[PDB]
Amino acid sequence: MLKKKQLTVLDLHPGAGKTRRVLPEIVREAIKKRLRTVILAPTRVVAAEMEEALRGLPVRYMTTAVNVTHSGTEIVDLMCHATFTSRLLQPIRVPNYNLNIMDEAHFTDPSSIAARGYISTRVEMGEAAAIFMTATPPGTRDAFPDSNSPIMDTEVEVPERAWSSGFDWVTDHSGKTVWFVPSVRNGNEIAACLTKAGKRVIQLSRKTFETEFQKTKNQEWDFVITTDISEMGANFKADRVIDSRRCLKPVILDGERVILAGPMPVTHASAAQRRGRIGRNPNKPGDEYMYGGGCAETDEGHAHWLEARMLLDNIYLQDGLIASLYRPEADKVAAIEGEFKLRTEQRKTFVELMKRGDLPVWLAYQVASAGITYTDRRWCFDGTTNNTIMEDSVPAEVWTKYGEKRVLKPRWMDARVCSDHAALKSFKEFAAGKR
């Protein structure tokens, strides 16, 4: 695996021991060969599990998710996918890693896709080696891969709203269920219906994942209601998955706005990862996977792959050269390499809008490419009437930094800034000049 110009896809089935068995063996061999190595975890939760699995090896944990004193001598760095891409974008020195290991390498967040593009380009140039660890590599067509124990697969109508009758199988279960929903708002409604029926429900999504995931360990629960974030190495002691087989797809319409299309079918890779939360214990056969629709390759035209090009266009590789997307996922976007390359000052603005601003890549790009400075929030108020953001069916309102009450009406409308109450609260604070 460790020879220059090699990219290895470590595609053992879910729970085959890629993280707990194979990764420490790879790391021991890398230190032996004096290979400067990076290990990319999808989430802080996974970074912490890796620290436990690599305990006793010289690894620098570039995450506050791990409280450990470093020797100062480590040639192996461990950080989140997003942290890798973030450091490449910033005027911060990132070493030339000889070996690039990405765990949960199916992750379709823009920063993960960009990290794969950068790494796979370095390998294709003959500059480095890489290992992508995932049961479900890009373009996989198998929603039903092997497992540690036999799984009971059942195609069944799954509720996507509160229900009063007709789904007794859902609540009649006495074990623990992980239930994949397409959105936070859809999970809230299902969670409330289960709570009313006497169930203990934990809800997970991207913004709450680190905090809430700990509850699955510290308290008893009947259901976990989760978005697609639990596809990225989240482990549960569960015996059933309920899978809507539905997701939302961000779509850029007419180059001018982002909508959240769907819900629509998940990819085969997503379905396999959702299913792969169970069947993990060889001593407990007959875990259940109930699934409520088909799969389709909905990553085609999905805004994350265009956002990944925006990130890679703004990352230095070699003189004018720009990293390509990893070949198997490179057709998911119709884009010109370099089309999103910003001049130094607009790139700095782009970075700050993502990092401090917490804006979606697409929206950060529109603002930075328009020549707007990070603190200039006039654009949050001067859009067309149909860009009005609504809150409880009235136009949303904030007090500007000038102390004026104004309707939130952004010049560029990205549905992700108001997809739930927490998102819209964050965007209101942004529009108000509070960060």
Ligand SMILES: Fc1ccccc1CNc1cn[nH]c1
């Ligand atoms: F009530 C005010 C007086 C002066 C400036 C602003 C406000 C409103 N609150 C706010 C919005 N952004 N930052 C602060």
